[PDB]
Write a protein that binds this ligand. Sequence first.
Ligand SMILES: NCCc1c[nH]c2ccccc12
Lengths: 35, 348
Amino acid sequence: XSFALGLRKDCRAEIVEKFTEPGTVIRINEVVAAL
Amino acid sequence: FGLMQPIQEFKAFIESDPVVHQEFIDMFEGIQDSPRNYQELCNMFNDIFRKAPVYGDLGPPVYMIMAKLMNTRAGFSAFTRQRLNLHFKKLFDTWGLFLSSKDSRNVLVADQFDDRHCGWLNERALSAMVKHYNGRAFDEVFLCDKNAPYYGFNSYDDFFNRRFRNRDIDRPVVGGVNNTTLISAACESLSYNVSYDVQSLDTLVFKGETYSLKHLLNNDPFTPQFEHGSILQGFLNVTAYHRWHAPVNGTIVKIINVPGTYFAQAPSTIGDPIPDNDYDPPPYLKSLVYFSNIAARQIMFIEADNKEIGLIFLVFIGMTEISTCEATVSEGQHVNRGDDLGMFHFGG
Ligand SMILES: NCCc1c[nH]c2ccccc12
C-alpha cells in the first residue's frame, strides 16, 4: 502492498475526484493531484 | 523433519513467554485445517520460506495461512508485540534471500499446478498481470525476453520488480514531466481511501480507525505541517507492478524506515467473515487505513520544485510478508515525476 500520498492543507494541488471512490484504477504515473 | 534456524528461534520465542505462548494457543481455537497449532505453523513456514509464490490465491502465501489467526483477539494481541515482529522481520528477510536467488525461478514457468494455481508464465497469470494495459501483452509492457527460460528473469524478486519496457506507451507521465503543478501516482494500484482534514489521535481505538498523522509519520518533526491536510491511499494487489515512481518534480528531503506490524488488522473487524472467494474483501483488506498507522513502513518527505505544492509525503506501507521498502534515491537527490524511486520486496 500500500502507499499513501500526503498533502498539506495549503497545497494548491488537490486530489483528483475520481480517486475518492474506492476500487478505482490508479495507473502509475497518471495524475492524482493537480492545481 | 528439521526447521531452519530462524524458525527454531521464532518457536523458542513463542515458548519463552507464558502470555505469548497462550496467545499462540488461543488464536487456534476451533480451527479444523492446517495450521491447527503453532508447531504446524512453524512447519508450514519452513516450507513456504524455501519456495516462491505461485499465481492463483487472493494474497501471498503467509497471509493465506495467517488470515484466520489474524482474525482473533489472541492473534491481534500477539501480532502487535514489537518483540514478536522482530522475529517476523527476520523470517521474511530470510525468505527474501531465497526469493532473490536463482533457485526461486522455478515458479517462472508456464505450468499449471492444479485447478487454481499456475506458474507466472502461464497464460492465466500473464493475462491477469496485463489486465490494465489496454490489450498489450506481458512482454510488450514489461522488460523481459519472452524467448528465454524464465522470461530472462534472474529470480522471483527480479520478476516481482520487473520494469516497464516502454513507459511512454503504457504508463506515460501524463501532462508532461516539465509541468511542475502535477502530482502523479507513485504506485500502480487501486484507490483505497481519500481522507480530508487529517489529524492526530492519541490512541488507535474506535474513532473510525482512521489516520493518525503522528502515528503514520512516527512523530516526525514535519508532522504538524500536515495537520488539516489530505491523504490518498492506494492498494497494490498481488499482480501489480511493485516499483515506486517519483510523484512530483522535487527534492528528496528525508527517508525514514519504521519497524512495525505485519499481521495486524483493524480491531473492529476481528471476527468478521473471511469470504471463500477472491472478490468479497476479507477483514485485513478492510484495514489498510488502520494499519497504515502501525505497519512496517517507509516515510519519504519530498519538497516539490513547485512551492505551491511544497513539502509532501509518501508512506510505503508493508502488508504481511511484502513489507520491505527499498528506496533507491538518496536524501538531497532531485527527482522528476515518473523517475525510479524504489520498490517493495518480500521481506520484513
Ligand atoms: N503486495 C501484494 C499484495 C498483498 C500483500 N500482502 C497481502 C495480504 C493480503 C492480500 C494481498 C496482499
